[PDB]
């Protein structure tokens, strides 16, 4: 009897046993643990090399089990109908917290309870960075481990105190430690290896804002071009079939084709084929969401509309023409701002982004100061027509408007098509 | 529409930075009222619960801090007593008697 | 590779279809080949050499063989930077010196690669002596202008010649169409 | 455009090659200020890097 | 060995500095714990000014 060792069930009698579902599945204990919970009794594990084992009476269980883990760690467990029977209560943790003065005060008290020495400005800066990590204006990040790590770095850079300057220094150092790829990209842009048009007008070319994933984060601009030729109603997206892709119908290509075919109804079929290419790979294309940049570039190519290269265009688009929210909007806007500032801020550069992302706009201090000074502009759009109006600097409707120019380009392509059609007859 | 600076300014205005903050510690699961209420129900009723959420939340730390404030009835002394050299039973005694 | 769409082929087709618009479709088919394999092709990047050779074939433009052509290109005709530019330029210089430098050889390379041009001593000495030339181009039209020794727009310009070749090919295709009909 | 030799010359102009150079050893991570600063932070704070 | 020692776990008061190539750390940084233990990244530029 004296060799029986107490495990975790014995030590948690009349108390709480906190386990990890990831551990319950990693060591395969979940079957035996389920059996113990359902039976209400458990005996200590016995190695098979013992034909002398005790007939130990099963140990009663008067504990409460509190599994802890990620939702994906529990997807394996919630499939079992018995897991939903033993564990009736689900204590779900929100990935964010409301951004309120009460929550900022609670964060300050939590940081003080961790041993940090805070300042009101330092607490404010930490709270703002927590809001930015959630990428939401009215929601601060719930991940207290990450905020604690940032506070640790801020304390180290400020000696022992979390002042505003120390937290700003910690954030800047975190940015710098992962800025090698972006420093190389900016150096290439400045030298001329990667040429992005940040000034003037261009026909069929736009500055899309991509998030690079063949490399680390910090989304950056990319010159996306659209070329319009007489032909079928086929919309070619060169980057989405870099290999095959004729076997694959792409949701972005289908969305763009639907918009172009349905919005422009004066010939029975789109008399123009539009080829969309992302020059300077390192561009990770969506393939499932049609970009607003692609649509405005296609419209410019069709109508020979010179779009402003000052403004970068980001945000998904819908087949109706509705601009949808995109992730990492702050990263894209700040990457374009970095590129513009590296080449010199002309005072007319900007970013065209959806109004849906306005609740996710937590731009850094430099971008906001440029916006205040009028050196950087942020345009928020609902529809692709608004983005095209901003880019081409003209209203869609009215005489000599963008709509009439696009229709004239379409009818010119149709005339080229019929000129080739009579070539097939006579 | 062209967004103005005030339509884009999100940072909380800093007002004072010459003094440290004196803030009482927050209750466990601050800003997590759903998780706190679910765990309170699981403690009141004695049900088994499971905590779900993204990593780096400090779920274990907050859970331990919340459970440390609970006051459960004094658990009895559970022990293993040999009823023979081969048969071992489970004995339950009043707390502090084992 | 006939069951796979190639980014280089798509880029070249997009450029040719979009830039030359006077018939409903490109009335010419262009076959691009690399003589003397040992050539490692890149199917994801359209070469500037491929585009200028295609334009020469369409317009019957005699390109200068003095100048080698390196660099990528996009569907708008913008010449992009390429890797190992020094290796390519020095290899062409080695070939030219092996056969004898005539004072007119050269390499047409992107202006994007000017920050990567660290040519060796012999190439730089030939460049200073006027025996080797380096041409840096922004667009494929500039490369074609240098190769064919004529401006795109003007008295019998390259653009007019390419359009005339396209009209000739379209007339041949109309002859075939009426052959199909009559 | 036809690049001139000066627009193509990149080698640092050699001014002398006779006397040996006397140069103090560089600080660790020279030209690597990002890594040096990251390691300074990881040493001051005791984090794992 | 069936009979052994109940050695008290040795406390760790060291700083770990992993060294490797960017592709070497691709296989390790998927784990949320790696980003929690190793928070400082001392990345080396492949070139210098």
mmCIF file of N, CA, C and O in Angstrom, chain D residues 10-47:
data_model
loop_
_atom_site.group_PDB
_atom_site.id
_atom_site.type_symbol
_atom_site.label_atom_id
_atom_site.label_comp_id
_atom_site.label_asym_id
_atom_site.label_seq_id
_atom_site.Cartn_x
_atom_site.Cartn_y
_atom_site.Cartn_z
ATOM 1 N N UNK D 10 32.527 51.089 -60.526
ATOM 2 C CA UNK D 10 32.062 50.843 -59.172
ATOM 3 C C UNK D 10 33.186 50.607 -58.176
ATOM 4 O O UNK D 10 32.960 50.761 -56.971
ATOM 5 N N UNK D 11 34.376 50.234 -58.636
ATOM 6 C CA UNK D 11 35.462 49.873 -57.740
ATOM 7 C C UNK D 11 35.960 51.094 -56.979
ATOM 8 O O UNK D 11 36.046 52.195 -57.529
ATOM 9 N N UNK D 12 36.281 50.890 -55.707
ATOM 10 C CA UNK D 12 36.805 51.972 -54.889
ATOM 11 C C UNK D 12 38.166 52.403 -55.427
ATOM 12 O O UNK D 12 39.038 51.550 -55.645
ATOM 13 N N UNK D 13 38.385 53.697 -55.665
ATOM 14 C CA UNK D 13 39.668 54.138 -56.229
ATOM 15 C C UNK D 13 40.847 53.819 -55.325
ATOM 16 O O UNK D 13 40.916 54.295 -54.188
ATOM 17 N N UNK D 14 41.780 53.011 -55.825
ATOM 18 C CA UNK D 14 42.975 52.678 -55.060
ATOM 19 C C UNK D 14 43.945 53.851 -55.130
ATOM 20 O O UNK D 14 44.331 54.292 -56.218
ATOM 21 N N UNK D 15 44.342 54.359 -53.967
ATOM 22 C CA UNK D 15 45.272 55.478 -53.874
ATOM 23 C C UNK D 15 46.686 55.058 -53.507
ATOM 24 O O UNK D 15 47.643 55.723 -53.908
ATOM 25 N N UNK D 16 46.843 53.968 -52.759
ATOM 26 C CA UNK D 16 48.158 53.430 -52.444
ATOM 27 C C UNK D 16 47.999 51.969 -52.048
ATOM 28 O O UNK D 16 46.948 51.571 -51.541
ATOM 29 N N UNK D 17 49.043 51.176 -52.293
ATOM 30 C CA UNK D 17 49.018 49.754 -51.976
ATOM 31 C C UNK D 17 50.318 49.271 -51.345
ATOM 32 O O UNK D 17 50.555 48.059 -51.297
ATOM 33 N N UNK D 18 51.164 50.178 -50.860
ATOM 34 C CA UNK D 18 52.475 49.798 -50.348
ATOM 35 C C UNK D 18 52.452 49.547 -48.842
ATOM 36 O O UNK D 18 52.771 48.445 -48.385
ATOM 37 N N UNK D 19 52.076 50.560 -48.062
ATOM 38 C CA UNK D 19 52.176 50.389 -46.617
ATOM 39 C C UNK D 19 51.020 49.543 -46.090
ATOM 40 O O UNK D 19 49.899 49.632 -46.601
ATOM 41 N N UNK D 20 51.277 48.708 -45.087
ATOM 42 C CA UNK D 20 50.191 47.950 -44.460
ATOM 43 C C UNK D 20 49.263 48.862 -43.674
ATOM 44 O O UNK D 20 49.646 49.933 -43.201
ATOM 45 N N UNK D 21 48.019 48.417 -43.541
ATOM 46 C CA UNK D 21 47.013 49.190 -42.822
ATOM 47 C C UNK D 21 47.064 48.848 -41.340
ATOM 48 O O UNK D 21 47.324 47.706 -40.944
ATOM 49 N N UNK D 22 46.823 49.859 -40.509
ATOM 50 C CA UNK D 22 46.702 49.697 -39.065
ATOM 51 C C UNK D 22 45.299 50.136 -38.672
ATOM 52 O O UNK D 22 45.010 51.336 -38.625
ATOM 53 N N UNK D 23 44.426 49.165 -38.396
ATOM 54 C CA UNK D 23 43.032 49.451 -38.108
ATOM 55 C C UNK D 23 42.628 48.762 -36.810
ATOM 56 O O UNK D 23 42.936 47.570 -36.620
ATOM 57 N N UNK D 24 41.952 49.469 -35.902
ATOM 58 C CA UNK D 24 41.486 48.823 -34.678
ATOM 59 C C UNK D 24 40.421 47.790 -34.991
ATOM 60 O O UNK D 24 39.694 47.911 -35.992
ATOM 61 N N UNK D 25 40.302 46.744 -34.175
ATOM 62 C CA UNK D 25 39.272 45.743 -34.425
ATOM 63 C C UNK D 25 37.894 46.368 -34.361
ATOM 64 O O UNK D 25 37.635 47.264 -33.535
ATOM 65 N N UNK D 26 36.977 45.932 -35.216
ATOM 66 C CA UNK D 26 35.632 46.493 -35.210
ATOM 67 C C UNK D 26 34.839 45.979 -34.024
ATOM 68 O O UNK D 26 35.155 44.916 -33.468
ATOM 69 N N UNK D 27 33.806 46.707 -33.597
ATOM 70 C CA UNK D 27 32.930 46.179 -32.560
ATOM 71 C C UNK D 27 32.182 44.961 -33.068
ATOM 72 O O UNK D 27 31.952 44.821 -34.281
ATOM 73 N N UNK D 28 31.805 44.040 -32.183
ATOM 74 C CA UNK D 28 31.030 42.876 -32.627
ATOM 75 C C UNK D 28 29.731 43.310 -33.286
ATOM 76 O O UNK D 28 29.093 44.276 -32.865
ATOM 77 N N UNK D 29 29.351 42.582 -34.336
ATOM 78 C CA UNK D 29 28.222 42.939 -35.193
ATOM 79 C C UNK D 29 28.410 44.338 -35.784
ATOM 80 O O UNK D 29 27.612 45.250 -35.564
ATOM 81 N N UNK D 30 29.495 44.498 -36.537
ATOM 82 C CA UNK D 30 29.706 45.731 -37.280
ATOM 83 C C UNK D 30 28.904 45.688 -38.573
ATOM 84 O O UNK D 30 28.903 44.683 -39.289
ATOM 85 N N UNK D 31 28.197 46.779 -38.856
ATOM 86 C CA UNK D 31 27.258 46.779 -39.957
ATOM 87 C C UNK D 31 26.011 45.967 -39.707
ATOM 88 O O UNK D 31 25.193 45.814 -40.619
ATOM 89 N N UNK D 32 25.834 45.454 -38.494
ATOM 90 C CA UNK D 32 24.696 44.633 -38.099
ATOM 91 C C UNK D 32 24.023 45.241 -36.880
ATOM 92 O O UNK D 32 23.774 44.576 -35.873
ATOM 93 N N UNK D 33 23.739 46.544 -36.963
ATOM 94 C CA UNK D 33 23.218 47.277 -35.814
ATOM 95 C C UNK D 33 21.893 46.710 -35.324
ATOM 96 O O UNK D 33 21.598 46.779 -34.127
ATOM 97 N N UNK D 34 21.081 46.149 -36.221
ATOM 98 C CA UNK D 34 19.810 45.567 -35.800
ATOM 99 C C UNK D 34 20.033 44.374 -34.877
ATOM 100 O O UNK D 34 19.451 44.302 -33.788
ATOM 101 N N UNK D 35 20.882 43.434 -35.295
ATOM 102 C CA UNK D 35 21.173 42.272 -34.462
ATOM 103 C C UNK D 35 21.884 42.675 -33.178
ATOM 104 O O UNK D 35 21.611 42.116 -32.109
ATOM 105 N N UNK D 36 22.803 43.638 -33.263
ATOM 106 C CA UNK D 36 23.513 44.087 -32.071
ATOM 107 C C UNK D 36 22.559 44.707 -31.060
ATOM 108 O O UNK D 36 22.651 44.428 -29.860
ATOM 109 N N UNK D 37 21.627 45.541 -31.524
ATOM 110 C CA UNK D 37 20.661 46.152 -30.616
ATOM 111 C C UNK D 37 19.696 45.117 -30.053
ATOM 112 O O UNK D 37 19.315 45.189 -28.878
ATOM 113 N N UNK D 38 19.288 44.145 -30.873
ATOM 114 C CA UNK D 38 18.420 43.086 -30.374
ATOM 115 C C UNK D 38 19.108 42.282 -29.280
ATOM 116 O O UNK D 38 18.497 41.963 -28.255
ATOM 117 N N UNK D 39 20.386 41.955 -29.472
ATOM 118 C CA UNK D 39 21.121 41.230 -28.442
ATOM 119 C C UNK D 39 21.382 42.090 -27.214
ATOM 120 O O UNK D 39 21.393 41.570 -26.094
ATOM 121 N N UNK D 40 21.584 43.397 -27.395
ATOM 122 C CA UNK D 40 21.680 44.292 -26.247
ATOM 123 C C UNK D 40 20.403 44.254 -25.422
ATOM 124 O O UNK D 40 20.451 44.203 -24.188
ATOM 125 N N UNK D 41 19.248 44.287 -26.090
ATOM 126 C CA UNK D 41 17.979 44.192 -25.374
ATOM 127 C C UNK D 41 17.824 42.838 -24.693
ATOM 128 O O UNK D 41 17.367 42.763 -23.548
ATOM 129 N N UNK D 42 18.195 41.758 -25.382
ATOM 130 C CA UNK D 42 18.069 40.422 -24.814
ATOM 131 C C UNK D 42 19.014 40.184 -23.646
ATOM 132 O O UNK D 42 18.729 39.325 -22.807
ATOM 133 N N UNK D 43 20.125 40.910 -23.576
ATOM 134 C CA UNK D 43 21.059 40.796 -22.466
ATOM 135 C C UNK D 43 20.661 41.696 -21.303
ATOM 136 O O UNK D 43 20.735 41.283 -20.145
ATOM 137 N N UNK D 44 20.228 42.925 -21.595
ATOM 138 C CA UNK D 44 19.773 43.819 -20.537
ATOM 139 C C UNK D 44 18.549 43.255 -19.828
ATOM 140 O O UNK D 44 18.438 43.346 -18.600
ATOM 141 N N UNK D 45 17.621 42.674 -20.581
ATOM 142 C CA UNK D 45 16.396 42.167 -20.001
ATOM 143 C C UNK D 45 16.438 40.700 -19.639
ATOM 144 O O UNK D 45 15.553 40.203 -18.936
ATOM 145 N N UNK D 46 17.457 39.993 -20.113
ATOM 146 C CA UNK D 46 17.571 38.582 -19.821
ATOM 147 C C UNK D 46 16.624 37.692 -20.587
ATOM 148 O O UNK D 46 16.399 36.550 -20.176
ATOM 149 N N UNK D 47 16.056 38.176 -21.687
ATOM 150 C CA UNK D 47 15.184 37.346 -22.497
ATOM 151 C C UNK D 47 15.999 36.346 -23.307
ATOM 152 O O UNK D 47 17.203 36.508 -23.519
#
